[PDB]
């Protein structure tokens, strides 16, 4: 089974009204049984609707989706979107993480995770959750750290230790410096296995940064991970694109992984 997290830079009406970009976005997303899409700026869900229509172009129900409400402390707010192949997996339910008091300017996440629970008959782990995160780059250390508490919360809600935490964590370059790692409970705790390594390049631009990550916890899920299957998908190289076209699709590569 194949799972990916993809930040598609300011995804919304503009990209979805461009047939060339749609073509590639669809081709990338269609690789996966579950795909998290981040940076969804789509206040009326019309871009999301266009995406699904394109995903389902030659067969209805090829993809279903779950989408969060817009999240963020001010403009511009972003939705977390999960598209998935419903013949492969089922999105069972979801909830918004309680990151404390927003009106207070006190809360722990810019875009608190909208957590989705999946059932998957073809893998060694049947029940697992995905916690999505597009971290605020200026608060990346505290937000990644806070995912430790999100993990503990998932066990409170669902009794579930099998949890994949993934997305654009902004976990590298200037946002998380080499020595700041011990400040991050999600990293210091042996509860978690970091699948995308520190050496990864997950940017479509010429920087070399391991921004986008996939982290797993729980006996059944960790056992289900194919070791070394977690990698950035360089769609520029894969499809032989120019720098221009690649970067117009997104400034990030998806990060993908296989579960057995
Ligand atoms: C759809 O997207 C493509 C790719 O970004 C756009 O085509 C590019 O347009 C720019 C600016 O005019 C050119 O510099 C590139 O040479 C074009 N790239 C390719 C691959 O052809 C196009 O502008 C978009 N279409 C519309 C109508 O906005
Ligand atoms: C945030 O603000 C409220 C009101 O000032 C305060 O009572 C609370 O202790 C603060 N919360 C945290 C988690 O620091
Ligand atoms: Ca918040
Ligand atoms: Ca790069
Ligand atoms: Mg971005």
UniProtKB/Swiss-Prot annotation:
Role noted for this protein: Serum endocuclease secreted into body fluids by a wide variety of exocrine and endocrine organs. Expressed by non-hematopoietic tissues and preferentially cleaves protein-free DNA. Among other functions, seems to be involved in cell death by apoptosis. Binds specifically to G-actin and blocks actin polymerization. Together with DNASE1L3, plays a key role in degrading neutrophil extracellular traps (NETs). NETs are mainly composed of DNA fibers and are released by neutrophils to bind pathogens during inflammation.
Q: What is this protein called?
A: Deoxyribonuclease-1
The record's annotation in CDD domains points to: DNase1 (cd10282)
What Gene Ontology cellular component terms go with this record?
A: extracellular exosome; extracellular region; nuclear envelope; nucleus; zymogen granule
User: In which tissues does this protein get expressed?
Assistant: Principally in tissues of the digestive system. Highest levels found in urine, but also relatively abundant in semen and saliva.
The linked condition is: Systemic lupus erythematosus: A chronic, relapsing, inflammatory, and often febrile multisystemic disorder of connective tissue, characterized principally by involvement of the skin, joints, kidneys and serosal membranes. It is of unknown etiology, but is thought to represent a failure of the regulatory mechanisms of the autoimmune system. The disease is marked by a wide range of system dysfunctions, an elevated erythrocyte sedimentation rate, and the formation of LE cells in the blood or bone marrow.
Q: What reaction gets catalysed by this protein?
A: Endonucleolytic cleavage to 5'-phosphodinucleotide and 5'-phosphooligonucleotide end-products
Main localization category: secreted
Q: Which cofactor does it need?
A: Ca(2+); Mg(2+)
Question: Where found in the cell?
Answer: Secreted; Zymogen granule; Nucleus envelope
What's the reported outcome of changing residue 222 to Q?
Answer: In allele DNASE1*1
| Alphabetical keyword list | Actin-binding, Apoptosis, Calcium, Cytoplasmic vesicle, Disulfide bond, Endonuclease, Glycoprotein, Hydrolase, Nuclease, Nucleus, Pharmaceutical, Secreted, Signal, Systemic lupus erythematosus
TM helices/strands, residue ranges: none
Q: Which GO biological process categories is it annotated with?
A: apoptotic process; DNA catabolic process; neutrophil activation involved in immune response; regulation of acute inflammatory response; regulation of neutrophil mediated cytotoxicity
């Amino acid at each position: 089974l194949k799972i990916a997290a993809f930040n598609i830079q300011t995804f919304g009406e503009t990209k979805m009204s461009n047939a060339t970009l749609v073509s590639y976005i669809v081709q990338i997303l269609s690789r996966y049984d579950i795909a998290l899409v981040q940076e969804v700026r789509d206040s009326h869900l019309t871009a999301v609707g266009k995406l699904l229509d394109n995903l389902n172009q030659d067969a209805p129900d090829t993809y279903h989706y779950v989408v969060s409400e817009p999240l963020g402390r001010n403009s511009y707010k972003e939705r977390y979107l999960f598209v998935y192949r419903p013949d492969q997996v089922s999105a069972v339910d979801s909830y918004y993480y309680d990151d404390g008091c927003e009106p207070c300017g006190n809360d722990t996440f810019n875009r608190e995770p909208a957590i989705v629970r999946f059932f998957s008959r073809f893998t060694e782990v049947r029940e697992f959750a995905i916690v999505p995160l597009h971290a605020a780059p200026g608060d990346a250390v505290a937000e990644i750290d806070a995912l430790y508490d999100v993990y503990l919360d998932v066990q409170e809600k669902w009794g579930l230790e099998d949890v994949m935490l993934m997305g654009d964590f902004n976990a590298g370059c200037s946002y998380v410096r080499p020595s700041q790692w011990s400040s991050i409970r999600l990293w210091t705790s042996p509860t978690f296995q970091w699948l995308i390594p520190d050496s990864a390049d997950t940017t479509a631009t010429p920087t070399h940064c391991a921004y986008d990550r996939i982290v797993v916890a729980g006996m059944l899920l960790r056992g289900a991970v194919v070791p070394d299957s977690a990698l950035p998908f360089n769609f520029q190289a894969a499809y032989g694109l120019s720098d221009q076209l690649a970067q117009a699709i997104s400034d990030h590569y998806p990060v993908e992984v296989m579960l057995k």
